[PDB]
């Protein structure tokens, strides 16, 4: 597989990346506490937002409104309007670092998760917390909404992946599955957009694929390779492929049905922390120690 690199930012370490739905922009949230807005067509730094102390691990655009959300090691979830260029409000509530934050695709909700061992759901119009999901016994490193069902998947350093039934779209939330298999902490999880599958990535250097029925869930297979912690993973939305990124300085592509290696991409001296895909285009971004790369695959 070929990587067609479209843009590379050079910066201090980047942690999060978010693709705008219609403009050729990405937000990149940095370890230094700054949030950068880049035009990746021209390669221009359009703006920089300063509203956190310490790393900014979570970053996401709203799908239709001129809003983005950021989440930081200062424990805050911040909501911004990028047209007016203003920080609108802070959702404080988390009691330790925020690891992820994202908007729901339809409801006026923000999802966040934290080292405080909770996943929280906020209504961004009323600006209050509407749900707190407890159960993990260590940091929650990742949480994500299912694209079509009332489910959330989360990953924790407690070595489990959890699937939560959220119900309460209309207690609010119950744990449906607890997935054990990783022998070390789990850093990331993802839903397939259409199949009942989940991917996870761990400090065991493994990416695991799981499947769900209405009543059961279990481990399908393992992507073996990576020689350090696997930071992030996702399903290719248009091909039967798995993508993963790791502190071993590689992005790897694997076949979804076989878990065989397809391609490895390396950087000389940059650990990878995060990968994402554009919500409409076949466009990917990866965050690493020296900035962010935006690329297409074959």
């Amino acid at each position: 597989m070929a990587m067609l690199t479209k843009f590379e930012s050079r910066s201090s370490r980047a942690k999060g990346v978010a693709f705008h739905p219609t403009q050729p922009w990405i937000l990149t949230s940095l370890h230094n506490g700054r949030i950068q807005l880049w035009d990746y067509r021209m390669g221009t730094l359009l703006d920089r937002f300063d509203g956190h102390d310490g790393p900014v691990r979570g970053i996401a655009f709203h799908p239709t409104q001129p809003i983005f959300v950021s989440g930081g090691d200062d424990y805050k979830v911040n909501v911004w309007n990028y047209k007016s260029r203003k920080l609108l409000f802070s959702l404080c509530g988390h009691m330790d670092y925020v690891r992820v934050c994202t908007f729901h695709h339809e409801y006026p909700w923000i999802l966040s998760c934290s080292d405080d061992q909770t996943i929280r759901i906020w209504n961004w119009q009323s600006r209050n917390c509407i749900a707190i999901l407890t159960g993990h016994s260590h940091y929650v490193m990742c949480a994500a909404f299912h694209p079509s069902e009332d489910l959330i998947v989360s990953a924790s350093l407690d070595q489990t992946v959890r699937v939560w039934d959220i119900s309460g779209l209309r207690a609010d939330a119950i744990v449906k599955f607890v997935l054990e298999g990783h022998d070390r902490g789990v850093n990331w999880c993802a839903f397939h957009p259409t199949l009942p599958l989940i991917l996870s990535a761990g400090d065991d250097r493994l990416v695991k694929l799981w499947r769900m029925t209405a009543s059961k869930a279990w481990e399908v297979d393992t992507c073996r390779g990576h020689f350090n912690n696997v930071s992030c993973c996702l399903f290719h939305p248009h091909q039967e492929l798995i993508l993963s990124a790791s502190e071993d300085k590689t992005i790897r592509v694997w076949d979804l049905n076989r878990r065989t290696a397809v391609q490895t991409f390396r950087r000389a001296n940059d650990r990878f922390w995060f990968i994402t895909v554009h919500p409409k285009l076949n466009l990917f971004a990866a965050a690493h120690d020296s900035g962010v790369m935006v690329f297409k695959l074959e």
């Binding site: 370490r13 370890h31 670092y97 080292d115 940091y139 490193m141 350093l157 850093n187 650990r271 922390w273």
Partner: peptide
């Protein structure tokens, strides 16, 4: 005492 700081 904390982990995953990078």
């Amino acid at each position: 005492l904390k982990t995953k700081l990078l």
